[PDB]
Design a protein around this nucleic acid. Structure first.
Lengths: 224, 123, 109, 76, 48
RNA sequence: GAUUACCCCUUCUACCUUUUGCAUAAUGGUUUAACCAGAAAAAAUCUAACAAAGAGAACUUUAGCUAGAUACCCCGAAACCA
């Protein structure tokens, strides 16, 4: 049995501190990340969000009449039916989007679960994943966050998953206000799309706890 | 929804760019330009294939002339050159038949010499 | 005084200072000096030497220099068949090599 | 749980091929062992490994009994 | 073995642009437009 | 192709459609622009998930099951009925 040991650095996030120690055992890690699964999950996530509102009018749905513009023979002109025909510039298209549909589909649970798992592994081994005990934002201002990201040399895009959404106003207020770099989201609302959207992941101890619980229970349910 | 955009206009522009110097609507209209272009390329291939034939015939004519000046015909000269183990091409042989009459005179002399020696050895 | 050489399955009439283009590549670096065989030799004193099926290596020599490796103007080759819907367009560029003839050596035996 | 995956692959209706999945350790060594084991029995060693993010061991014949026995007794 | 080889080298961090399917995953759907099969779209000449 | 910064000479039986066969005195087109006619997955091949189980309380299953990806175009009557 190979046990992966990951070091969790506790940051009191005031300033000038990279010092912290916690021993983490992320059994959720996978040997080789699947690109195919991740791609399918991304494509699917892009797929069920489609509104499918594209509309047109077939020749039958055209306001124009179905009367014959002239006689079949003797006129000297070409043979023609109603002017709502697609061959006419007053008509529509037959193969057009007009008929509606739904571009989504039902993806197996093990596939999407293994997708989030593999993605988490990718972010893990990429050094872009950091674990903390807690989060503190006493001053709660954009300048503090920016200078923190610049001084601590974090990633260009960092996804912060900490809160259970039920507490800690001081953080959320400053974090959700006018910030392009950092994004916020509850621990129970963590998804693969959000992780792949950002180049850097930062999780806290409860977040990692619930995450590893959910992922170990899903891996144990998929193995059994 | 897509659009026709500049694609067709650029293709037409290219064909017409290759349709320059052509006569009439073929250097103006697109369809006739294409129709003339196809024929132009076919004629390119065919004439490039028959060019070697034309040049060969011309060279043969020149060498025939230069040979007849010395009293012998083209086929006899060819045979004599074959039995003389001369692999020289008819292009260079014609060039010598024009600019350097001395070399062709020597080859003709050796030709008549081989012919007379063969006619004397056969008798 | 001129010579007649053979290369790439083609025979050529070479003279001093002349520039001759030969098909494709000779597998020789640019600037290098190479030697060529002799099919025929003709001296301007009206003295000709023709060996078979080759000339003397010790008797006569030909030395030329490669300027560079160029490419001839692109030739468009198209095949068309009537009402077979068969059209094939291919643009072919013929590789060439520039040779500068420098020294034609003739020695007495 | 059950010991090891065993994949019986059908390329066509009446045609059958054997497929194994990576479990423990590297695939190369186990593949070499498979070759050395199947060489005297089959007479040939047509072993092929297909590796993308994981791996698949494919051979010509039916060794699946000896396969299961091997991967059982070994414990991998 | 692949984990160590993937963790050893520094990659592009795998942006969404770096996502690629496995070989033969999705078929390059055939479009009837072309000189490959002329004008009949593979239906042959006339008939029903 | 040669040839002159232009041309004569030499080398070649329009396109498309329909056909055993068309430069054909068989068909369609004044030219140009633009518009305009292959959108259906059962079984199968293939890429992945798990495996005597797959699949989001519904079905299949003596290696299956699930998901994704692959093939079946338009115009035209004379007439009928209300």
């Amino acid at each position: 049995x190979x046990x992966x040991x990951x070091x969790x650095x506790x940051x009191x996030x005031x300033x000038x501190x990279x010092x912290g120690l916690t021993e983490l055992h992320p059994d959720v890690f996978s040997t080789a990340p699947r690109l195919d699964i991740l791609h399918q999950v991304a494509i699917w996530q892009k797929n069920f969000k489609r509104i499918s509102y594209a509309k047109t009018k077939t020749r039958a749905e055209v306001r124009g009449g179905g009367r014959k513009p002239w006689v079949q023979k003797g006129s000297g002109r070409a043979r023609h039916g109603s002017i709502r025909s697609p061959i006419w510039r007053g008509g529509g298209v037959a193969h057009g989007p007009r008929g509606p549909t739904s571009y989504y589909y039902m993806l197996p649970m093990k596939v999407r679960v293994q997708g989030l798992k593999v993605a988490l592994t990718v972010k893990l081994a990429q050094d872009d994943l950091h674990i903390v005990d807690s989060l503190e934002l006493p001053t709660a201002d954009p300048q503090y966050l920016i200078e923190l990201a610049r001084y601590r040399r974090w990633g260009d895009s960092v996804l912060l998953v900490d809160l259970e959404h039920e507490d800690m106003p001081q953080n959320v207020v400053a974090a959700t206000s006018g910030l392009k770099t950092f994004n916020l989201v509850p621990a129970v609302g963590l998804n693969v799309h959000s992780m792949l959207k950002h180049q850097t992941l930062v999780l806290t101890l409860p977040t990692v706890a619930f995450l590893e619980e959910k992922l170990x229970x899903x891996x144990x349910x998929x193995x059994x | 929804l897509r659009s026709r955009v500049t694609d067709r206009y650029w293709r037409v522009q290219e064909v017409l760019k290759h349709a320059r110097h052509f006569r009439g609507r073929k250097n103006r209209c697109y369809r006739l330009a294409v129709r003339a272009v196809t024929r132009a390329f076919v004629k390119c291939t065919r004439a490039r294939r028959l060019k070697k034939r034309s040049l060969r015939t011309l060279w043969i004519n020149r060498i025939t002339a230069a040979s007849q000046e010395h009293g012998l015909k083209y086929p006899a000269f060819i045979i004599n050159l074959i039995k003389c183990q001369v692999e020289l091409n008819r292009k260079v042989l014609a060039d010598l038949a024009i600019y350097e009459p001395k070399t062709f005179k020597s080859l003709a002399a050796l030709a008549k010499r081989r012919r007379x020696x063969x006619x004397x050895x056969x008798x | 005084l001129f010579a007649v050489v053979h290369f790439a399955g083609h025979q050529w009439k070479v003279t001093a200072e002349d520039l001759i283009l030969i098909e494709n590549e000779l597998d020789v670096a640019c600037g290098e000096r190479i030697r060529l065989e002799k099919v025929l030799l003709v001296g301007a004193d009206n003295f000709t030497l023709l060996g078979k099926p080759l000339l003397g290596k010790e008797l006569v020599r030909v030395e030329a220099t490669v300027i560079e490796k160029t490419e001839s103007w692109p030739k468009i080759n198209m095949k068309f068949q009537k009402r077979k819907n068969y059209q094939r367009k291919r643009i072919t560029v013929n590789p060439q090599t520039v040779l500068r003839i420098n020294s034609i050596e003739x020695x007495x035996x | 749980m059950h010991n090891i995956p065993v994949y019986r692959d059908i390329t066509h209706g009446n045609r059958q091929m054997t497929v194994i999945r990576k479990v423990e350790g590297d695939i190369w060594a186990l593949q070499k062992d498979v070759e050395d084991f199947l060489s005297p029995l089959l007479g040939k060693t047509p072993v092929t490994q297909v590796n993308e993010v994981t791996g698949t061991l494919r051979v010509k014949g039916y060794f699946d009994q000896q396969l299961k026995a091997w991967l059982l007794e070994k414990g991998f | 073995x692949x984990x160590x080889x993937x963790x050893x080298x520094x990659x592009x961090x795998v942006s969404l642009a770096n996502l690629k399917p496995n070989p033969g995953s999705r078929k390059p759907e055939r479009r009837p437009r072309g000189r490959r099969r002329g004008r009949k779209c593979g239906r042959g000449h006339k008939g029903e």
